[PDB]
């Protein structure tokens, strides 16, 4: 692909209709933990370990302290430059007309910390909740999210599991239900959401320029979309630290961290 | 489409 940021600053200064998808590298730039990187473990596993349908069947405390000590470790962390230059450019441009969405592989909010007001969370949050017998979601932020997981977590090796008895874990305050929390994340395996497919399709078949930033593309339907928008003939610019397997079927690739090269493309 |  081409790397001439004039030649994007082109296509940006007329279109109205900005899709914009972030992967982990966004995070990670805040120095989010992920857990997805070579070497990078919670005691002794990775996300592709821990979130799984299997690991919440075979011992949901344990998931239950992966995800507590996540939550925990996002007070200590802040949007960076990438976040707050998408931000800024959603409110500037909405005051022209023009429209930015954000549609993030990311669970850990910090685009809606940044400001962020048009975010779809493909893969859903930290801070909801699922509950496993009546499906209902819901917001929650509380440190910490039940009593038993006070003080848990600590991601060290050699740190004990908790063994928290499943009626101590978060349950379901729906009048009548009770049921076993699990957080509202999308797992290794399973299916996002439709409704939010079907947002998600609705903002690719109507946008005029997309946005790749910080992401693999190996974490499927996801590295899917930005290939379909240029179907259409729409612009795809990928913004991530090293080219991937879907780096040949965009427009351009700008090479850098994206804290770096996206304030200049969003200006 | 499911998570991969
Ligand atoms: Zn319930």
Request: net charge positive; hydrophobic share 35%.
């Amino acid at each position: 692909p081409s790397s001439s940021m004039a030649d994007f600053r082109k296509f940006f200064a007329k279109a109205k209709h900005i899709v914009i998808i972030s992967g982990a590298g966004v995070s990670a730039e805040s120095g989010v933990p992920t857990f997805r990187g070579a070497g990078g473990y919670w005691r002794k596993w990775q996300a592709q370990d821990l979130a799984t349908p299997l690991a919440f069947a075979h011992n949901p405390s344990r998931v239950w302290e992966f995800y507590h000590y996540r939550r925990e470790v996002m007070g200590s962390k802040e949007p960076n430059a990438g976040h707050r230059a998408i931000a800024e450019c959603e409110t500037r441009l909405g005051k022209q007309g023009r429209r930015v969405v954000v549609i993030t592989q990311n669970i850990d909010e910090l685009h809606r910390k940044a400001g962020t007001k048009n975010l779809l969370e493909i893969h859903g949050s930290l801070f909801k909740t699922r509950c496993t017998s009546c499906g209902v979601v819901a917001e929650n932020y509380k440190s910490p999210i039940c009593p038993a997981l006070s003080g848990k977590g600590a991601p060290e090796p050699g740190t004990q599991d908790a063994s928290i008895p499943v009626e101590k874990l978060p349950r379901c305050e729906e009048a009548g239900c009770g049921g076993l929390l699990r957080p509202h994340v999308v797992w290794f395996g399973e299916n996002l959401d439709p409704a939010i497919l079907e947002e998600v399709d609705r903002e690719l078949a109507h946008c005029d320029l997309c946005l790749v930033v910080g992401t693999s593309s190996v974490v499927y339907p996801a590295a899917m979309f930005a290939p379909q928008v240029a179907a259409r003939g729409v612009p795809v610019a990928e913004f991530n630290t090293e080219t991937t397997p879907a780096t040949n079927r965009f427009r351009f690739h700008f090479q850098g961290p994206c804290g770096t090269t996206l304030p200049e493309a969003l200006a | 489409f499911s998570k991969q």
